[PDB]
Design a protein around this ligand. Sequence first.
Ligand SMILES: [Mg+2]
Ligand SMILES: [Zn+2]
Ligand SMILES: [Zn+2]
Lengths: 431, 1344
Amino acid sequence: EIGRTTDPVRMYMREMGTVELLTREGEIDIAKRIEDGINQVQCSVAEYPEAITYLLEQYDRVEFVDPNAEELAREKFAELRAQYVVTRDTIKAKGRSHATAQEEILKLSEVFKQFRLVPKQFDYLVNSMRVMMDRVRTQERLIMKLCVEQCKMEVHRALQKLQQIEEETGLTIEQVKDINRRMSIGEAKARRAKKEMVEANLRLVISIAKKYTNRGLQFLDLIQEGNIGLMKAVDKFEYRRGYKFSTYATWWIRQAITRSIADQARTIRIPVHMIETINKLNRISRQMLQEMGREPTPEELAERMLMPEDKIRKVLKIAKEPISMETPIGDDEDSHLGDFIEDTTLELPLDSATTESLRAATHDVLAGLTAREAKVLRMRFGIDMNTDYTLEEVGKQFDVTRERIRQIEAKALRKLRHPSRSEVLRSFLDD
Amino acid sequence: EEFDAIKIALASPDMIRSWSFGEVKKPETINYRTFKPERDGLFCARIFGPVKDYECLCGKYKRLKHRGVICEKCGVEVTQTKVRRERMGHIELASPTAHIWFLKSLPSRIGLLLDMPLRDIERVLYFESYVVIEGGMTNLERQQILTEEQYLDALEEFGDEFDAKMGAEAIQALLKSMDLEQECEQLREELNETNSETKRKKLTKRIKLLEAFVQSGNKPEWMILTVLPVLPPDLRPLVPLDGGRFATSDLNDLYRRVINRNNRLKRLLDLAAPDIIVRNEKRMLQEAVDALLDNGRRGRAITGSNKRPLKSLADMIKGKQGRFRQNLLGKRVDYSGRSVITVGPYLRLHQCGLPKKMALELFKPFIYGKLELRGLATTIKAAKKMVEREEAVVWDILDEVIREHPVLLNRAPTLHRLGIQAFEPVLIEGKAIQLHPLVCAAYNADFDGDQMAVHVPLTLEAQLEARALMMSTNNILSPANGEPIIVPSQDVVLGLYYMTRDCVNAKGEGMVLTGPKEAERLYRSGLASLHARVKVRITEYEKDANGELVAKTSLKDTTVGRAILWMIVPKGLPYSIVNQALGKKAISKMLNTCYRILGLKPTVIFADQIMYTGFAYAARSGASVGIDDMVIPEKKHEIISEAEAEVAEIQEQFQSGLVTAGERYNKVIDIWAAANDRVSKAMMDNLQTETVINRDGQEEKQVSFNSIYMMADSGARGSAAQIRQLAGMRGLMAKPDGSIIETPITANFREGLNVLQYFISTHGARKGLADTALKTANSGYLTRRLVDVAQDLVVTEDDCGTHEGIMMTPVIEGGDVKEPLRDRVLGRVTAEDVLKPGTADILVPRNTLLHEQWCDLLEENSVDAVKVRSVVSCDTDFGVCAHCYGRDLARGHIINKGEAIGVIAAQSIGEPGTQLTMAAESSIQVKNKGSIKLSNVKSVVNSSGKLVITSRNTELKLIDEFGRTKESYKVPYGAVLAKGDGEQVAGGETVANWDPHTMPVITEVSGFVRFTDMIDGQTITRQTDELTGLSSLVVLDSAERTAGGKDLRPALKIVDAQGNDVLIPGTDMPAQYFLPGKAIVQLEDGVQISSGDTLARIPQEITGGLPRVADLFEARRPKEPAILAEISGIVSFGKETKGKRRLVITPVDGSDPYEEMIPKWRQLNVFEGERVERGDVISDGPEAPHDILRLRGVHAVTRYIVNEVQDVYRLQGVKINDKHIEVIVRQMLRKATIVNAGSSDFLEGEQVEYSRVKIANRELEANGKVGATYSRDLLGITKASLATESFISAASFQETTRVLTEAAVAGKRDELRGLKENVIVGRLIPAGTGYAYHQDRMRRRAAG
Ligand SMILES: [Mg+2]
Ligand SMILES: [Zn+2]
Ligand SMILES: [Zn+2]
C-alpha cells in the first residue's frame, strides 16, 4: 500500500504506531524485571572472588559519603575486610567450593550489596572479567579447533599451554565460564526489558517535542534528542517512589531538548547561560510592551531586569544571527547579496608598484653610503636579509664596542639627514 | 603547471583522505566574542591554514625563520594566507551513504549494474525491506527482496547460512561482491542466441557500461560514500558586514547539519539504543548528505531560515547562473567604460569621439609611465597627485598616449561579429561618445538613448589585431552574404536624390559648360539652378587591358547637379553612374562598383565623400514636412459612397434568403478590398506625377517635388503603405486573433479617426508589439544552440582531394525563377568539370574559383546545372579544406587556413531571426511560350486521342530557345493531357485536366466488363433514385463487410465476346485489374465502358515562421509522415490482422520479402504491384528528414534542408548564403551506427563518430582486412551538441549533472580541441592568430 512516501517523518510515525501503550501495570512489571536482572548480575559478580580482591585493592590504593546501607567508610569497611580475609581461609579449608565457604560467600555478598558503588568501578570490574575471558578464549580456540578436527574424541604438547593458562588464572575455568555467561544473560534480560518502555513512550516524546518545534532545528532532530533524554529517564526511574512514570520522564525530555536547541541551531555558538539571559529578556519585553502599550527603552528594561545598562546593550547587540549570502537584494530575483560584497585582503597594484620602487630607491641611497655604514644599517634593520640582528650580535661580529655601533648609527642618520641625499625619500612623505 | 588534458573519474575513500589535511569534528565556526576560529570547527586554522599571513596564534615561531614548521602549541602553521583557498578537509561517516547522483540521475547507474528496479533499491535503502546478499542454501538467491515478516520466517527455520541486510550497507555489500567478468561474458553469450529488439538494446547498453567500467579501473564500491570531503573555507566565506552583522554561504549550514547528525549517530551507537532509533538516525544522515550534494532532487528541498531552499553544490555548478556560464565563459573586465552615443558627422570612417574624462580614467597606468619617463614626477604617488589635480602637462601626455592606440566599441546584444569594432579615438569634451554615421547599420544603433561600451586593448599583439582584423575600414562587406554593409542612408540619400534630379526650364537651360568646375561656380553664384538641363564637357577614365587608365573626353548632356557631383567620383568609373537621378539602390551599386574595380582605399575615401556631400546638399535643399503635403484624392468620398451603397444592397438582398452567411461575408470583404485599391491608386496618381510646367510655351508634365513623395522615391525613409495610411484609407483590420472585421476604417491620419475606429486599431497594435517582445528570446535561444553545435569547425587543410560534390540548378518553384545561378554558385569551387562538346563547347577547368568573369562566361553560354564542391562532402578529418569551402565572403578571396567557420555560420543564420515573423487547382496553365519536355512519364493513349498519365511522379517543364527551364509543375496521377511531347505550347494554354476532388481510375481499352468477387449486400449497396431510376454501385470495405463476404476482393474483368484477354506484347502480365476497396462504379455490371472513362471516384477531401526553422534544424518528426518505398520489386497487400493493413513488397530480383504495417485510416496511393524504387513515395503528407537520409542519401537530405530553410528567409527578403546552412548540416550528421562484425573493436548497435570509423577502416584496409559497415545517423541540434567527444563542452552547454555523471563513470579524458574548452581553461583558441601556436605544440607530440 506504501505510496512511496519518501517523507522520513511518515516512516517514523508508521514504525512507531505499531507498539501500543500500557500503563500503571507494565511500568511496574518492566521495572521489576530490570531490577531483577541487575540483582542477578550483582550477585554473580560477587560470586567471583578475584573481582572482590581487585576492587578492595583498588579501594585501598586510592584511599564517597552517605552510603545507603539499609572515616565512616574506612570503619564500615574494616569489618568487611576482616570477614573477607577470614572467608578466604575457609575456602582454603578442605573444600574448594565447599558448602560452608559458599554460605560465607553468600553472606559476604548480602553484606556487600548493602553498600553503594560508583558505576565506573562496576564497569571496571566487568571489564576485568571480560579481558581474562577473552584471553582464555583466544588462547584456547586453536586447541579446541585442533582437538575437534584432528583428534575427534600434539595432545601433551598442546596440554602445556592449557595448563599454563590455568596456572596464570589460578581458578577453575568452569566457574569463570558460568559467571561470564550469567553476566551475559542478566545483561540481556535488562537490555531487552528497557527496550519495551523505550518503544512504549515514543508518543510522549513526540508530544513534548512538537511543543518546541516552532521553527527551531527541525522536527526530527528534536524528536531524536528527546529520545536520548527518554533513554536517560528510563535508566534513572524507580517505581519504589510510587509515582507515575510520565511525571519523571518529562523533566529529562525537556532538559535534553532544550539543551540541544541551545548548543546547536546557531552558526556562531552562543553558550547556554547567554541563551537563558536572552530568553529572559524576550519574556520580559513582551509583558512590559503590553503593559506600557509601546516598545520598552533599554533603560527601563535594565531597571526591570536589575542589571546595568551596558550589560543589556551588550546582549542586544550580541543577539542577531547571520544573513544568507544568497538573499535577493534586487527586486528582480537576478542579483544576490553575494555579488555585492568586496574582497578586503588584496592589496592594490598601485601600492605594490610603490613598494617595489621604495625598495629600489632605498638600495640606491644605501649603496652611496660608506661600505661599513651601509652594511651596518642593513644588519641592524634586517633590510634585504631575512631577519634583523640586534645590537649585541652586530657588536660581537664587527666590533665588540656597543656604544660604537650607537655612534655609527648617529653618524649615518646625520649623513642621510643631509638635504642632498634625502631628496627622493621626501616623496614618501605622506606615509 | 603546464598540462595537456583533463580526466575525470570516481574517488576512492583513500583518495579523499589523500586530499585532506585533517578531519572536521565539530560543527562550530567561530567564537562569539573574539571572532577567531574554533579548534576543530569548520574554519580551523590548523587544518585549513592560517588566517593572517606569517603569524601563528601564539607567535613563538615567527620572523620567517620557520618555513613550513608547525607551531605546536597553537597548532597554526606559519605560511601565506592563500592556502585557506585551496586546502580541503574530510568527514568520516559512521554509516555508508549512497551518492545521490549515481542513484537517482536516470538511468540510475546503480540500477544498471545490479539489474534491479529503482524502487527496490529505494525500499532497501529506507529500511523498509531486507535483501538477500548470499543464499548458500538453495532456498533463496541474490537480489531477492524480503519483507519484514518474511525474513523472520526464513531466519527461524534456516539460519546461519542466510545473509540478508538492509540499507546502504546491503547495497554496498552487493556491489562489492559482484564480479564483472562473469556477467560480461554471460551477456556476450546471451545476445548471441535471441535478439528481442528491446531486450537486445538493453543488453547492449548494460554490456557497454560493464566493459567501460572494467576498462576505466573504477570499482563499483566507490559509488557509495564512507568518507566525505569538505570544501576550503574561503570558497564558503563567513564575512563581517560593516553593520556588525555577518554574511554566510549556505554550504556552512548544510555541512553543519551533516556533522551534527553524524556525531549523534556515533553517540547513539556507543550507547546501545533500540533499533528503531538508530534506523531513524541512519535515514536522517542519509537525507542530510543528499541535501548537501543536490538539494531538492530527493523530493522536498530543505528551506533555509527565511522561506527559501538552501543552495547546494550542484546548484553552484548547473544553471544559467552557475560557474560555467557566468564566471568562466564570460566575465567582467577591467579597463572598460560605458556611455550614451551621439552622432558626429565630421569624423572619418576610422575614428570615434571619446570623452576626455573617460579617456583619462581608462589610460591611467600608461599616463603614470610616461609621467615618470619624462621626469615630471619622481615617484608613482607624485604621479597620482599630478593626475587627480589635472595639470596641463597631464593633458599633453594623454594626447601623446592615445595617438595610434585603437579602442574597441561594443553594443549589446552582439548579434553578429560586426557588433564589436575597433576605432581610433579623437578626444572631445562632453560626456557622450560620438559614433560615425555610416556604422550605425552594422550596430543596429539609433541615437535615441542607446549606450555603448568601450574596451582598451593592452598588449602589442592585441593592438595589432585590433588594427588589422577588427578596424572599421576593414569591414565593408558582410560575412553572411557578399553585399556591402557601409550603405548610405536617410539624409545622405535625400541629399543625393535632390541634388541629382532634373527639372523643366528652371534657370540656365541649354548652356554649355567647360567641365564641372564651371558648374559649381555657376550654381553657387546664383546664376543657375541645380536642376538645369545643361551640356557639359566631361573626361572619363577607363581601365585598360593591363590596368592602364585611358582618358576619354566628350561633350555630354547632363544637369548642373550631376556635374557637381562628378567631382567626387574616383577616376576609373564610367560617367553613366552619375548621370541618372540617384536613389538608394543606385548609391549602393555605385559603392559596390567602385569596390570591385578599384580596390579598398578608393572606396573608403569615396564613401566618406559621399556622406559629406549628401549632408551638405540635403541641408541646402531645406526639405520640410507640412500638413498640406499629404494630399487626398478629390474623388475619395465618391468611391466610399458607391461601395457603401453597394454593400447596403447586398445586405438587403441577404434578407431575401438568396445569400447565406458565408456568401455575404466573402462578398462584402471583396467589395471593400476593391474600394481600397481604387482609393490607393487614385491617391498615388494624384500625388506622384502632379506638376504642370511651361516649357517656354505650352504645358508639360513631370514628376512632382512633393516632399513626402521625395521621401518615398528616394528610398530615404518612407514606403508606399505608410503614405497610403497618411492619405488614403487606413484599411481593414483584424479581430484579436484571426477574423477580419467586416467594415474597414475609412479615415486616414490627416482626417483623424473617431473613437470606435481607434479602439479597433489598438488590437493589432498591441498584438504586434507583444509579438516582438516575446520573439526576441526564442531568437536568442536558437542562435545559442546553433553556435554550440558548430564551433569546432576551422579550416584545417588546403585540398582534401575529394571528387564528390552537389549538383546545383536554379530554383524554378512554380512558374517564375526564384534564384538564378550567378547568385547561387558565385564563389564556389567546381569539381568534376562539366564539359559540353557540341552546342556550347563548354570548358570549365577543374577546381577554379568562380569569379564574376567566370559567371559572366557561364551566363553567355547559358548553362543551367553545375556540380560544385561542398562542405558536407569534404574528406578532411576534424575540419574542412579551403577548397571545399570557397570564398571568404567578407574578404573576397579563397578562405584562409585557420579561420573559425562554425561560429560565423551560426551567427549569420541566427542574426536575422529577430525580423523573421513570430483555390483554383483545376488545371495546369503555361505562362510563357516555349517547348514541353516531360520526365519520368507513363503514358497511355485513349480513343479520344488524349494522353493519359499513370506514372506517380510526372514533372512538367518549359524549355526555352536557348535550352533552359523556365517553369516546372507536378502532374497528378490520372490527369488527362492536351498535347504530347515535343511541340511548342503557347502562352496561357492549358495542358492538363483532371478532377480535383477525385482520383479516377482511367480506362485504356474497351470491351465487356465483368464485376468479379463483388456481391450486393456483401460488398456493395443497392441505391435507388427517383422516376429516372439511375443506380450507383459503391464498394463497401472490410470494416463493414460481413463475415461471409470477407475473402471477396473486388475486380473488373475486361473481356471480349470470347472472353480471351489479349496479352500485352512482350510482357507476360495478366490483365487482372483488382481495384481496391470503394471502387465506385455507378454504371451497373455489363455496361460498355469507353477507353479513358472514370471507373472509380475516390475523393481526396504549415507553421512557416521561426518555429518552422527551429523544427527543421532540430530534425523533429512530422506527426503524419509520408511513407516511402524501401525496396524495388512487386507490391501487394497481405493478410489483415485486427485491421493492421499488411503491405508486402517482394523484390523482382531480390528474394527477401519486406513487410510494412500500415495504419488503418491512412490511404494508399499505389494500388498493387508497380515498379517502385528506393524511397518512392506511397502516402501523402509531410516528409521526415530521417527517412530522406536513410533512403535517398546524404546529398538528398542536405538539399531538402537547404531548400526548406531558405524558403522561410526568402519570404521575408533575407539573403543568406547557402554555405552556412550546409556547414550546420555537416555538423549535424556527425555520428554513425555500426551494423557488421568488422575487424576492429566494435559491436552491433554502437554509435561512434563517423571520423573514428573512417580512421579505423582505412587503417585496416591498408592491411588487407575488411572493416565494419556503418550507416550515418541524423541528430538534432541539441542531441548532436550533447554527444561530442568532450565532457567540458557538453557540460558547459546544458544538462550538467547528467553528462558529468556519465563522464565520471566512464573515466573519460578531455583532450582540449575545441574553442569553448580552451576559452574555459584560459588559453589561446585554435583559430586565427592562435592557430600557429597550437600547430607548434602539435609537432611537440613528435618529440615525446
Ligand atoms: Mg533606439
Ligand atoms: Zn604559535
Ligand atoms: Zn574538402
